[PDB]
Every structure is written in structure tokens, then in C-alpha cells.
Enzyme design. Structure first.
Site, short mmCIF file in Angstrom:
data_model
loop_
_atom_site.label_atom_id
_atom_site.label_comp_id
_atom_site.label_asym_id
_atom_site.label_seq_id
_atom_site.Cartn_x
_atom_site.Cartn_y
_atom_site.Cartn_z
N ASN A 249 0.85 -1.19 0.00
CA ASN A 249 0.00 0.00 0.00
C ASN A 249 0.88 1.24 0.00
O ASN A 249 1.86 1.31 0.76
CB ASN A 249 -0.94 -0.01 1.21
CG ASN A 249 -1.93 1.14 1.20
OD1 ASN A 249 -2.08 1.84 2.19
ND2 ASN A 249 -2.60 1.33 0.07
N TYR B 78 -7.17 14.09 -2.16
CA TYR B 78 -6.98 13.31 -0.94
C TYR B 78 -6.39 14.21 0.13
O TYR B 78 -5.49 15.01 -0.15
CB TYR B 78 -6.06 12.12 -1.23
CG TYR B 78 -5.53 11.40 -0.02
CD1 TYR B 78 -6.29 10.43 0.62
CD2 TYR B 78 -4.26 11.66 0.48
CE1 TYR B 78 -5.81 9.76 1.73
CE2 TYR B 78 -3.77 11.00 1.58
CZ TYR B 78 -4.55 10.05 2.21
OH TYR B 78 -4.07 9.37 3.31
N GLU C 54 -2.81 6.31 -5.27
CA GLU C 54 -2.69 5.29 -4.25
C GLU C 54 -2.77 3.92 -4.90
O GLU C 54 -3.53 3.72 -5.85
CB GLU C 54 -3.78 5.43 -3.17
CG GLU C 54 -3.87 4.25 -2.21
CD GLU C 54 -4.74 4.53 -1.00
OE1 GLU C 54 -5.36 5.62 -0.94
OE2 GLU C 54 -4.80 3.68 -0.09
N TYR D 268 -11.50 11.35 0.56
CA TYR D 268 -11.21 11.05 -0.83
C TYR D 268 -12.28 11.68 -1.71
O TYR D 268 -13.47 11.55 -1.44
CB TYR D 268 -11.21 9.54 -1.11
CG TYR D 268 -10.09 8.71 -0.52
CD1 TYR D 268 -10.09 8.35 0.82
CD2 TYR D 268 -9.06 8.24 -1.33
CE1 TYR D 268 -9.07 7.56 1.35
CE2 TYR D 268 -8.05 7.46 -0.81
CZ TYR D 268 -8.06 7.12 0.52
OH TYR D 268 -7.04 6.34 1.02
N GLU E 110 -9.91 11.38 7.20
CA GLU E 110 -9.18 11.14 5.96
C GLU E 110 -10.20 11.05 4.84
O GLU E 110 -11.10 10.20 4.89
CB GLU E 110 -8.34 9.86 6.05
CG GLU E 110 -7.69 9.42 4.75
CD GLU E 110 -6.99 8.07 4.89
OE1 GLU E 110 -7.62 7.13 5.42
OE2 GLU E 110 -5.82 7.95 4.47
#
Length: 184
Positions: free
Chosen positions: A44, A77, A171, A88, A86
């Protein structure tokens, strides 16, 4: 330049590059708001350029080429503090509680909330919510009026705190791919 994980500033833009330690990622800062990332069977990772701090009314421009082979996102982001969020605004991707929809910059987006439990964050290991807007008409270039999403989230009860960083990020999650993106 091709850099190691970390944060900093390059050619007038904030950048963040993070990974979980599973190799196969090459992240490169280019001129202006440009960055490129090549990944081969990564773990990741998240990397991109933008602003520290972001705002709740920024109109973000991006353009580039985005060719993932597996799980990946191309997103506006960022983070907020108090509450720790967090978020998106997903413009494209490779291969949750739904809360509503928003029509913004030429597409319907689906709005979701997820909870991360005991996961990494800008303040260390924490439990926190994620807010999502997932674009239906996927694209790798255009403009994002973030206020359209932040206001839509608030109308659904999704509150943002004080803004931390705010970037256009590529990502990847146990996949391969290539991307080159310019932010403005």
C-alpha cells in the site's frame, strides 16, 4: 527527483509520499505540480502533490495519464483534525455506508462513510472516519471544486475539522501501474 517516503515542499507545492514498506514503488517529483509514480507489485502506498494546509473552497486542477493494473485510486486526498478525517474525492480507480449522491464537475458522485480502526494516520495509530466521493464518470484530467463535496458531505452530517494537507494522490494496494500527474 525520485525520493524516499516523507513529506516536504517541491517547486512551490506540498508533497506527501507514504508506503507500508513493501517494495516496488518509484515516486518522482517533477517540475511545478508534476509528479510521477511507477509501482511493480507494491504493498500500500500514497503519493502526490498539493497544499499544506488545504482549504474548504479550493478548486483543484489536475491532468495526466493514469494506468493502474489492480487496486488503485486517483483522488483529491487529504486530512482534517478535530475531527480526524481522511477524505477522498475519487476521480479514477483501477479494479461502507452510502449516504447520498452529489453532481459536481460533470458527473454524479456516490458519497460514503467508512471507519478506520487502529490504523495509521497523520497523528499516529488512531480510529477515525473516512469520507468518500466516488466519481461515476472516471477520468484522469479535469477540475474539482472541493466545496461541492465538502458541502454535500456536511448536508449528510459528515463534518470536517481544521484542514491538514490536501493533494492529488495516486494510491496503490498490492497491484502494479504507472501514473504521471500535474496539479495546479
Amino acid at each position: 527527483q525520485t525520493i524516499q517516503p516523507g513529506t516536504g515542499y517541491n517547486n512551490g507545492y506540498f508533497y506527501s509520499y507514504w508506503n507500508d514498506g513493501h517494495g516496488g514503488v518509484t515516486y518522482t517529483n517533477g517540475p511545478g505540480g508534476q509528479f510521477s509514480v511507477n509501482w511493480s507489485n507494491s504493498g500500500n502506498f500514497v503519493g502526490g502533490k498539493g497544499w499544506q494546509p488545504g482549504t474548504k473552497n479550493k478548486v483543484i486542477n489536475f491532468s495526466g495519464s493514469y494506468n493502474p493494473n489492480g487496486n488503485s485510486y486517483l483522488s483529491v486526498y487529504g486530512w482534517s483534525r478535530n475531527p480526524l478525517i481522511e477524505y477522498y474525492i475519487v476521480e479514477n480507480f483501477g479494479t461502507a455506508t452510502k449516504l447520498g449522491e452529489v453532481t459536481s464537475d460533470g458527473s454524479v458522485y456516490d458519497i460514503y462513510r467508512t471507519q478506520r480502526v487502529n490504523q495509521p494516520s497523520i497523528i499516529g495509530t488512531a480510529t477515525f472516519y473516512q469520507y468518500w466521493s466516488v466519481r461515476r464518470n472516471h477520468r484522469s484530467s479535469g477540475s474539482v471544486n472541493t466545496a461541492n463535496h465538502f458541502n454535500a458531505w456536511a448536508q449528510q452530517g459528515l463534518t470536517l475539522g481544521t484542514m491538514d494537507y490536501q493533494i492529488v494522490a495516486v494510491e496503490g494496494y498490492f497491484s502494479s501501474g504507472s501514473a504521471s500527474i500535474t496539479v495546479s
